[PDB]
Design a binder for this molecule. Structure first.
Ligand code: HRY
Length: 126
C-alpha cells in the first residue's frame, strides 16, 4: 500500500496576504517547534513504506505534517490563522490516533503540543 500524494503546499490562483498572525505562525510558532529536539518525526509527510507502517493510510485519512505547514506559510497558502492552527492540530491528533501509549513519539507529540499551545495562547491581536 502506497503513500498518498503529499498535501498541496501552494496554489498560484489563491489570493495572498501577510498578516501579523500569519507572520507569528511562521516566525514564532512553526520556528519554535521546528528547531525543537523532537521536531524530526514531524518535519515531513509520513512515509509509511520506508517507516514500515503499512496500515498508516488505512487509518489516517487526513495526513498533515510540519514540513507541509512550513511550506504553506512560506508560500502564502493560508489566508486565516485558523487554517494553520487546524493543520497543527490535525498533525498532533493523527499521531495520537496511530501510535500507542508506550511509543516515544507519543510523549514527543505531547511535549511539542504543549509548546504549540503556549505559543498559540500568545497569538498576537488580528
Ligand atoms: C533523533 N535521532 C537520534 C534519530 C533520528 N532518526 C531515527 C530513524 N528515523 C526515523 N525513525 C522513525 N521511527 C523510528 C523511531 C525509533 C525510536 C524512537 C522514535 Cl520516536 C522513532 C520515524 C517515525 C516517524 C513517524 C512515525 C509515526 C508517526 O505518526 N509520525 C508522525 C512520524 C517519522 C520519521 C521517523 N524517522 C530517521 C531519524
Amino acid at each position: 500500500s502506497m503513500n498518498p500524494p503529499p498535501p498541496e503546499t501552494s496554489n498560484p490562483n489563491k489570493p495572498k496576504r501577510q498578516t501579523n498572525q500569519l507572520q507569528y505562525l511562521l516566525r514564532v510558532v512553526l520556528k519554535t517547534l521546528w528547531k525543537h529536539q523532537f521536531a524530526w518525526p514531524f518535519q515531513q509527510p509520513v512515509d509509511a513504506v520506508k517507516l514500515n507502517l503499512p496500515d498508516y493510510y488505512k487509518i489516517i485519512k487526513t495526513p498533515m505534517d510540519m514540513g507541509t505547514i512550513k511550506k504553506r506559510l512560506e508560500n502564502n497558502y493560508y489566508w486565516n490563522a485558523q487554517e494553520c492552527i487546524q493543520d497543527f492540530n490535525t498533525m498532533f491528533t493523527n499521531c495520537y490516533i496511530y501510535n500507542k501509549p508506550g511509543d516515544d513519539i507519543v510523549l514527543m507529540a505531547e511535549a511539542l503540543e504543549k509548546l504549540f499551545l503556549q505559543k498559540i495562547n500568545e497569538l498576537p491581536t488580528e
